[PDB]
Amino acid sequence: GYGKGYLAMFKNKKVRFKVVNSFPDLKVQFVTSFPDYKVKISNSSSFCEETIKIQVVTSFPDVKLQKVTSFGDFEAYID
């Protein structure tokens, strides 16, 4: 699927994370320290540039994301 650098394209933008169990665009591990990107989780599905299918994993992710309430690298609405 996509690589670690893909999300760099959405700096200061919002995407949609679609949770899947098979064939993800990105395997995503959520961490509380040392992420690859900081992401703000939005409650509104509006203004999402794009839909990215993500599989939540606990080991060997494509990317590590840290949920932040402020100063994210991008925003994501999860569905």
UniProtKB/Swiss-Prot annotation:
The protein's superkingdom reads: Bacteria
Q: Give the protein family.
A: To Synechocystis PCC 6803 slr1025.
* Annotated protein name in UniProt: Uncharacterized protein UU089.1
